[PDB]
Amino acid sequence: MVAFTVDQMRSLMDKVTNVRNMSVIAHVDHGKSTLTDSLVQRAGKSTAISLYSEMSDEDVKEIKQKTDGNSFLINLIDSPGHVDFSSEVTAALRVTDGALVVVDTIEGVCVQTETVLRQALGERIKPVVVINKVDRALLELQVSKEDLYQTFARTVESVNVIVSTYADEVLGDVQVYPARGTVAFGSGLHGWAFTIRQFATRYAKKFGVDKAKMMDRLWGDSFFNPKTKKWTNKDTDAEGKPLERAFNMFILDPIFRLFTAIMNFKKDEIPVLLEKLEIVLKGDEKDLEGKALLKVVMRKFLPAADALLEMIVLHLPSPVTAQAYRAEQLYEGPADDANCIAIKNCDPKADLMLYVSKMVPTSDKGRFYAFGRVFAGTVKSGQKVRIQGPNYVPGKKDDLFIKAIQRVVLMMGRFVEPIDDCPAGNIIGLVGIDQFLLKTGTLTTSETAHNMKVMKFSVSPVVQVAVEVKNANDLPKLVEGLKRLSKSDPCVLTYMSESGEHIVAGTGELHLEICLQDLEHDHAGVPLKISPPVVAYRETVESESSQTALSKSPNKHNRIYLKAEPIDEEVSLAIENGIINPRDDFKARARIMADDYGWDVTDARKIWCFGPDGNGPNLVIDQTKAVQYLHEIKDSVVAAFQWATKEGPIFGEEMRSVRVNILDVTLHADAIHRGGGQIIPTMRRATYAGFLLADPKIQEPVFLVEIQCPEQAVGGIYSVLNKKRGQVVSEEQRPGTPLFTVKAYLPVNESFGFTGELRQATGGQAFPQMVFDHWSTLGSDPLDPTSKAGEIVLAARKRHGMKEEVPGWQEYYDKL
Amino acid sequence: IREKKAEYFAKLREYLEEYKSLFVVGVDNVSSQQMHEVRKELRGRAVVLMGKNTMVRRAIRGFLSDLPDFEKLLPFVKGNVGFVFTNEPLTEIKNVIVSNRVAAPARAGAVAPEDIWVRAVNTGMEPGKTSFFQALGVPTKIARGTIEIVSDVKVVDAGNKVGQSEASLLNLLNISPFTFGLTVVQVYDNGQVFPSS
Amino acid sequence: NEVKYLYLRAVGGEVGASAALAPKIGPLGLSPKKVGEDIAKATKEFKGIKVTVQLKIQNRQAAASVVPSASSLVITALKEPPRDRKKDKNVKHSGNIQLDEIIEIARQMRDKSFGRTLASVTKEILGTAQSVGCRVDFKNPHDIIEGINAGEIEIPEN
RNA sequence: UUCAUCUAGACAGCCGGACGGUGGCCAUGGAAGUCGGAAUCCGCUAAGGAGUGUGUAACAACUCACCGGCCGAAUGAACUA
Numbered sequence A: 001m002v003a004f005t006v007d008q009m010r011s012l013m014d015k016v017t018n019v020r021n022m023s024v025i026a027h028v029d030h031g032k033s034t035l036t037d038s039l040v041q042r043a044g045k046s047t048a049i050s051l052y053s054e055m056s057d058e059d060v061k062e063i064k065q066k067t068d069g070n071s072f073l074i075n076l077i078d079s080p081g082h083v084d085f086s087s088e089v090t091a092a093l094r095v096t097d098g099a100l101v102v103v104d105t106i107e108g109v110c111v112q113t114e115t116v117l118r119q120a121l122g123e124r125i126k127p128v129v130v131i132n133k134v135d136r137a138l139l140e141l142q143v144s145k146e147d148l149y150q151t152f153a154r155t156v157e158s159v160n161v162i163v164s165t166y167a168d169e170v171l172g173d174v175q176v177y178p179a180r181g182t183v184a185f186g187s188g189l190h191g192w193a194f195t196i197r198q199f200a201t202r203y204a205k206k207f208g209v210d211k212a213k214m215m216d217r218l219w220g221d222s223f224f225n226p227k228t229k230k231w232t233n234k235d236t237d238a239e240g241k242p243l244e245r246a247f248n249m250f251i252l253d254p255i256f257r258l259f260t261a262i263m264n265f266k267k268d269e270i271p272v273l274l275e276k277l278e279i280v281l282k283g284d285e286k287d288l289e290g291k292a293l294l295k296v297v298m299r300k301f302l303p304a305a306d307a308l309l310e311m312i313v314l315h316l317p318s319p320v321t322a323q324a325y326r327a328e329q330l331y332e333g334p335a336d337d338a339n340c341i342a343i344k345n346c347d348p349k350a351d352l353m354l355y356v357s358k359m360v361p362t363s364d365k366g367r368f369y370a371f372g373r374v375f376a377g378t379v380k381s382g383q384k385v386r387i388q389g390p391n392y393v394p395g396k397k398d399d400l401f402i403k404a405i406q407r408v409v410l411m412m413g414r415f416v417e418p419i420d421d422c423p424a425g426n427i428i429g430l431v432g433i434d435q436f437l438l439k440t441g442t443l444t445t446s447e448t449a450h451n452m453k454v455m456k457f458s459v460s461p462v463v464q465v466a467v468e469v470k471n472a473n474d475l476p477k478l479v480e481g482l483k484r485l486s487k488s489d490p491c492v493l494t495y496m497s498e499s500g501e502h503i504v505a506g507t508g509e510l511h512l513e514i515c516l517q518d519l520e521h522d523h524a525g526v527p528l529k530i531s532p533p534v535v536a537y538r539e540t541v542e543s544e545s546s547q548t549a550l551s552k553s554p555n556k557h558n559r560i561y562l563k564a565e566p567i568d569e570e571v572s573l574a575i576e577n578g579i580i581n582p583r584d585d586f587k588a589r590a591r592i593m594a595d596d597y598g599w600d601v602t603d604a605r606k607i608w609c610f611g612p613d614g615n616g617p618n619l620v621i622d623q624t625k626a627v628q629y630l631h632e633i634k635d636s637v638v639a640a641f642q643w644a645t646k647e648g649p650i651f652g653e654e655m656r657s658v659r660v661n662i663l664d665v666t667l668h669a670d671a672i673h674r675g676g677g678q679i680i681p682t683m684r685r686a687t688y689a690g691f692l693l694a695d696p697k698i699q700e701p702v703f704l705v706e707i708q709c710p711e712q713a714v715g716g717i718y719s720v721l722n723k724k725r726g727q728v729v730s731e732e733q734r735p736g737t738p739l740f741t742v743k744a745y746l747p748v749n750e751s752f753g754f755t756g757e758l759r760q761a762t763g764g765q766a767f768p769q770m771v772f773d774h775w776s777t778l779g780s781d782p783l784d785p786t787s788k789a790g791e792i793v794l795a796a797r798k799r800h801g802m803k804e805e806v807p808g809w810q811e812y813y814d815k816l
Numbered sequence B: 001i002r003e004k005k006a007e008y009f010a011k012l013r014e015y016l017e018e019y020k021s022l023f024v025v026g027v028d029n030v031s032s033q034q035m036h037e038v039r040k041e042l043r044g045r046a047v048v049l050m051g052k053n054t055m056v057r058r059a060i061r062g063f064l065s066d067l068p069d070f071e072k073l074l075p076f077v078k079g080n081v082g083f084v085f086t087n088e089p090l091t092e093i094k095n096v097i098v099s100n101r102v103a104a105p106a107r108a109g110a111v112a113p114e115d116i117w118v119r120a121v122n123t124g125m126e127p128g129k130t131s132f133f134q135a136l137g138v139p140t141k142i143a144r145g146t147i148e149i150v151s152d153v154k155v156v157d158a159g160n161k162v163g164q165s166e167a168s169l170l171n172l173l174n175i176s177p178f179t180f181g182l183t184v185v186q187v188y189d190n191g192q193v194f195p196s197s
Numbered sequence C: 001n002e003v004k005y006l007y008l009r010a011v012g013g014e015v016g017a018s019a020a021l022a023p024k025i026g027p028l029g030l031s032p033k034k035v036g037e038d039i040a041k042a043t044k045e046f047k048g049i050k051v052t053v054q055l056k057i058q059n060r061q062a063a064a065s066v067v068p069s070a071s072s073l074v075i076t077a078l079k080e081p082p083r084d085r086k087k088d089k090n091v092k093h094s095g096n097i098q099l100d101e102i103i104e105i106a107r108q109m110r111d112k113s114f115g116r117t118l119a120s121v122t123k124e125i126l127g128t129a130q131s132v133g134c135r136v137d138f139k140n141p142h143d144i145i146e147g148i149n150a151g152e153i154e155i156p157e158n
Numbered sequence D: 001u002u003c004a005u006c007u008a009g010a011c012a013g014c015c016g017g018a019c020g021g022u023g024g025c026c027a028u029g030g031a032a033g034u035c036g037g038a039a040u041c042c043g044c045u046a047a048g049g050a051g052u053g054u055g056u057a058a059c060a061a062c063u064c065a066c067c068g069g070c071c072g073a074a075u076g077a078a079c080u081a
């Protein structure tokens, strides 16, 4: 359409049965941004594009879809093929119903084609397949006709294997075939494509032959057998010189003949064959020679803008006919609520349900139009709307907001059209919202409107790098950009680490480098540098403090004797998940340690405090016998324990799983001589001595990572794991599919470049997800400088500006 | 070495004047599992003895002085042949021997006797196995969650050895045009050798 | 009714994991839970000692039938207090199973064996026990074989 | 120089077999001859290692020790200078 009219497109939007909002998915460089471009050519990130297509009554009749009218409006998304942008395709998949799977004829069904197709089948989206770069097959590989037919056969067979392995048991017949017309073939770059249904229609105009069952004879083993006039069904040897199949003889043969003639420059035969193939000429296109003549003559004799759009109109369902079998899975609530059934109804008069998915920029920093698909009811310019949160609990007050809409917008090829209203089953942008909705969610007008799906994706943020602005005065700009992209890009994850560093996370090296380039140049606007994240360890003990650690006060009147012990991992877990809570009461919280954790009820009753932060997993226990003034130094001892559990004596990191047992104290009688200034340093030095005599050790955070890789790539999984010290936990196979699932504990230390190493070992087929699980004790000493735990401490000391050697246990210990 | 050879000679003597009749069984292409099965079957009825043809010939030639009858058995020890002695009706032993057979699978390299075919059948094979069919050019479609060959296809022709991909698909589809078992060249019986027939 | 055929080696009297059950049987629409319970039932007496488990898929039928595994029979006869994986790694086996018991294992193996004599099948089972390394009648299984060879252990050929 | 094989058929070459108990015991997340420790058994045996290598996540599947078919008179190994 050449900007037909704003109100004409408003009417087309109001039409909710001749509109198709589908997405073209393929492998990287398989030719989706060229097929979509060739579709938008006659139409005058993922921004929907609009195409106008007329259509005939015969092939509106030849449609298994509830429709009325004769003209169609295509809203097309160009999803990205890279595996690092595997969520920008998932968002379009959620917003869309049809999937044009481009498959390259040369390369076949590659890793990313399989990935995006398995995603579409997870969303139960019906795929239609187009085989691209047939011109490449015809000029590079020089397939004659049967090699090309067999390549088509293999491509269709592999796509059918994927769909038959990953089709949920609700459709079954979603298997793709050219025989049914769900597979096209053409050259996107050159501008031509065909379906065997289109050829079986092009033939009736000259042969009077039937079209109903010739469209399943033009594919497969079916032989017209000329000189005998009979559509035989097997080779039969042709009584010598076995003859060719209908596909090669009828569809490919004119194509290959035009190719041969126009590329061989047979100017005495080009016009004759061109007239036989009923093309039109231009005043100067007649003076077009090879390598572009064939291009234009096939762009005329076989229009891709028609071959693709006809199968899009026919086999790709409309909203009012496709939302039915997808509402039950896009609505976690039960199938027996009005909001649930409204999406199935696709009624433009029910309560509103509009899913913002993409925060589209607006040429202005911080206005952020809200792309989304309407599912139920009509949106209005200035209608009272209710924002829903991705974790919004519907019972009580949660991320529900009571704002409204400012202006409806329809997005186009980078320009916005101001609209006031649009019925259900359509694609529009919401101006005036999304500064109240973090990433995704829904916007409704009902008051019991359970949200629709969180739009889960197969990728996650697994590459983490720390960033910092050089000019510390321009740090507000850094954080402003760092949160202005965390909403624009859906899969980017940013946060503050356990060591005070902005940790930008992403899908892979390429996605991360794109995000970091956006940070450095466009979103923030300030030059910043990137580093590998510092892994925040913990300090702990793995022995029982061979001799008693002793400390004397600065005035020497007070003494502390203690020991250190390795609090068990289960006890520490109970602490951090609240089973043992500081606020709880002794002899009630101590009964749990006694009965269910092996502790002695006396010691569990004699818990002075938790550290660090006042609630951490480290404990201090009074093992002392009668002492005259023990309860007066309690506050000083708990303060010193908080200090010694925040700033450990190895590199100042927080303690974990440390038990301190105050065995004896010796306090001066006068309270003026056992004040805080005399007890806090004494207690912290005694705790440090206990730590450095109870076999000090460090603990590192370990990721739990689960990877969905197939049988062929599980060996690469294992190789990467045992090269990066990973521990194989559990393998499994999903029911019926070949996609494995391997779960493992990978240390955070050896976790940088790990996803890149895994993708290189598995050919991109391994899909990992990682999340911090727990802390593992490093077996090697952290006090020896050259020990495997002993160099991370040295690096921390250098990076923090402290000394190189570690203060030995002879310090913090007063000899007595 | 020579002691083991003498042991074999003595065992041959034992069989030659302990069993009225023997068979000359051809064991070409016969495996060892087949051999154990045959020995198990013939147990009680018959005994099976293998050796080196030269060993057997020299042993016989050295016992000919006492048993000059086996001079007519001597020109039948050629090729992969062994001796199945028995004290039982000829026909029973013959039938059992030529009854124990194995449809040996397609090992790549073996010259295929006759043209291997694949027919338009629902093979009942997990779809993932499509790789083999695509490698052999066998058109297939997934029906009822199983691979189904769409069109008859001559995998290899009569003559040319079964290639590795051909062998893989054949072992997949249980196609095995190799049947191996003991044949019978001649039968010795009471100083009289005669063809099996 | 199509007779499908598959094995496992689940540990004796040890609940079989669904991760080691579903991949094999799962295709032909049967619950990994129920098959695992069947394996446990078929290996009740086999407790501790792994064994093969023939399973005939007769139109989705959970017919667990323990295939006698020579080593499994040998060590279940060894009878050793349950081999507890948790208790100690590298659990050794030293069961003193008597010659009669070994002959019973031999007569439960002869059908699926090739040894000419019941004596020969006993020799096979003794070799399996020797592999296990257990003691037998206060002597090594190899020396028992030497006795049989020299005609000392008169075999009750039944 | 020394030790071996050899017309009871040697070496090389081509071809056939290379099994069963048995997924031997232990472990391993998985380990079926083949990432490891230990044990080096028995039957069928002409012959086959509880395994020489390739291979799988484990399988599988190839391959070799070992024995046979063909050929027919010599041949192999470790050393010395």
Ligand SMILES: CO[C@H]1[C@@H](O)[C@H](O)[C@H](OC[C@@]23C[C@@H]4[C@H](C)CC[C@H]4[C@@]4(C=O)C[C@@H]2C[C@H](C(C)C)[C@@]34C(=O)O)O[C@@H]1C
Pocket (backbone or CB within 6 Å): A464, A493, A495, A496, A497, A498, A499, A503, A533, A534, A535, A536, A537, A701, A748, A770, A771, A772, A773
């Ligand atoms: C959604 O993504 C989540 C998690 O899934 C993921 O585990 C990631 O890991 C961050 C770390 C979490 C660890 C625990 C909180 C204790 C130590 C922490 C880490 C080390 O310093 C380990 C991982 C990696 C990060 C360091 C190396 C920067 C961590 C951090 O937050 O500092 O955290 C983000 C927020």
Ligand SMILES: Nc1nc2c(ncn2[C@@H]2O[C@H](COP(=O)(O)OP(=O)(O)O)[C@@H](O)[C@H]2O)c(=O)[nH]1
Pocket (backbone or CB within 6 Å): A026, A027, A028, A029, A030, A031, A032, A033, A034, A035, A081, A132, A133, A134, A135, A136, A186, A187, A188, A189, A190
């Ligand atoms: N010969 C040929 N080249 C093609 C075809 N489709 C795409 N290409 C080439 O592929 C290159 C990039 O493809 P593109 O569509 O942009 O990649 P996409 O992101 O997957 O869509 C272009 O330079 C084209 O020349 C085709 O049908 N034939």
Ligand SMILES: [Mg+2]
Pocket (backbone or CB within 6 Å): A032, A033, A080, A081
């Ligand atoms: Mg693109």
Ligand SMILES: [Mg+2]
Pocket (backbone or CB within 6 Å): none
């Ligand atoms: Mg291995």
